[PDB]
Amino acid sequence: PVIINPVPGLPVDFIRGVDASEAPWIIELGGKYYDENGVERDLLDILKENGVNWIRLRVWNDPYDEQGRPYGGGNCDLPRMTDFAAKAKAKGFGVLIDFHYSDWWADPSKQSKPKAWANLSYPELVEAVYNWTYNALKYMAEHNALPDMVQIGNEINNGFLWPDGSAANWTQFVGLLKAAISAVKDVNPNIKIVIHLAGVKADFYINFIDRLINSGVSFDVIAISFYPYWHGTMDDFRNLVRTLVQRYDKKILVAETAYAWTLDDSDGHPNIFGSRDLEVKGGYKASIQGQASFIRDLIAALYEEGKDKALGIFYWGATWIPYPGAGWKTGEGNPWENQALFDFNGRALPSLKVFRLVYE
Ligand SMILES: [Ca+2]
Ligand SMILES: [Cl-]
């Protein structure tokens, strides 16, 4: 029962993607996904028929401890992530791989160097990011899972691989950033490079990207993490986009975004989207309709301003349904299930058709 306006002039090759990084782990535990009718189907088939054409997957180097026990949060190591990307690309999907260059979660508040990279000197570290990235993408290419797009680090606002690439050390930061890129192009120079940033502070994007472009860092896409309840209003997003299309001749992408289809909880583990508090920040209400309205408007806002540089969006945590063992951390539960595009029973929400109903 979801009402939605079409987006006039929206290209058929527009990136209407989702981040399904947690899905592979969920399926291994016995988690099941159901289509609009509520019958059990292949997840990728459910996404495709709903209009999703791209898949985004994060990759951690070694999300396990010295005892072999997994960290959690999907346990997104290269072998498990590559197997899903292979099946997705086999089903026609486009693939964006997000190398966090960390053993676990990375964002502008934490950018841990992997356990084996921790005490490598800077020169040895440059040799590490290159050789790992090269072999990483060489691994995916052979399982027929070469990603169309690569994302050098996740939300690298304050840099990555701290402290050696802590943005403060801009010179070293650029060396490591370039080193990874050199690796990607050596595997295939038609793979597109994605620089991912969080927030919609336009004046920061200017300062950061200008210094990046001037440093010789070659990339194709400027990716954005936009969570309205954190980063600002729809208008704040509009101002960022138009500022990027005028100042830069590069593509504009939303690497991460999400909203709440409900406020309830399923597994007893409190969610990030918890109270009506975040609901007044987002400007949209926490219903299945409110979720869909936000997504359609984000696609519209991006294209109406992005013009021919508008690339598309990825809905983050789309497949993160509540399931025992598939929490955000080993031993803990799910804080995101009320922001997925599936309900607690694993059934596709009627707002999943937003990636298809934006057309006409
Ligand atoms: Ca929960
Ligand atoms: Cl430096």
Numbering used by the authors: 37 to 396
The authors write:
Endo-β-1,4-galactanases, in particular hydrolyse galactan and arabinogalactan in pectin, a major component of the primary plant cell wall, with important functions in plant defence and application in the food and other industries. Endo-β-1,4-galactanases are glycoside hydrolases (EC 3.2.1.89) that degrade the galactan and arabinogalactan via a double displacement retaining mechanism using two carboxylic acids, one acting as a nucleophile and one functioning as an acid/base. In this article, we thus present the structure and characterization of the hyperthermophilic endo-β-1,4-galactanase catalytic domain from I. aggregans (IaGal). This catalytic domain, obtained from the C-terminal truncation of the full-length gene also encoding an Ig-like and a putative binding domain exhibits a temperature activity optimum of 95 °C making it an asset for future industrial biomass degradation.
As other enzymes in the GH53 family and clan GH-A, the overall structure of IaGal is a (β/α)8 barrel (also known as TIM barrel) which consists of 8 parallel β-sheets (here referred as β1 to β8) and 8 α-helices (here referred as α1 to α8) that alternate along the peptide chain. Loops connecting βn and αn will be referred to the nth β/α-loop. β4 and β7 bear the catalytic acid–base (Glu165) and nucleophile residues (Glu266), respectively. All galactanases structurally characterized to date contain a stabilizing interaction between the 7th and 8th β/α-loop in the (β/α)8 barrel except for BtGal, which has a significantly shorter 7th β/α-loop. The stabilizing interaction has been shown to be a disulphide bridge in all fungal galactanases, and a calcium binding site in BlGal (purple) and now archaeal (green) enzymes. A slight difference is observed in the calcium binding sites between BlGal and IaGal as Glu347 in the archaeal enzyme coordinates both with Oε1 and Oε2, while the corresponding Asp370 in BlGal is angled differently and only coordinates with one oxygen. This results in a coordination number for the calcium ion of 7 in IaGal compared to 6 in BlGal. From the structural point of view, IaGal can be considered an intermediate with respect to substrate binding subsites. The IaGal contains − 1, − 2 and − 3 binding subsites in addition to the + subsites, while the fungal galactanases are devoid of the − 3 subsite and BlGal contains the additional − 4 subsite. Differential scanning calorimetry (DSC) indicated a thermal denaturation midpoint (Tm) of 105 °C for IaGal making it to our knowledge the most thermostable galactanase ever reported. We find that, while salt-bridges and helix stabilization may contribute to IaGal thermostability, H-bonds and compactness do not, and cation–π and π–π interactions are the only features correlating strongly with thermophilicity in GH53 in general.
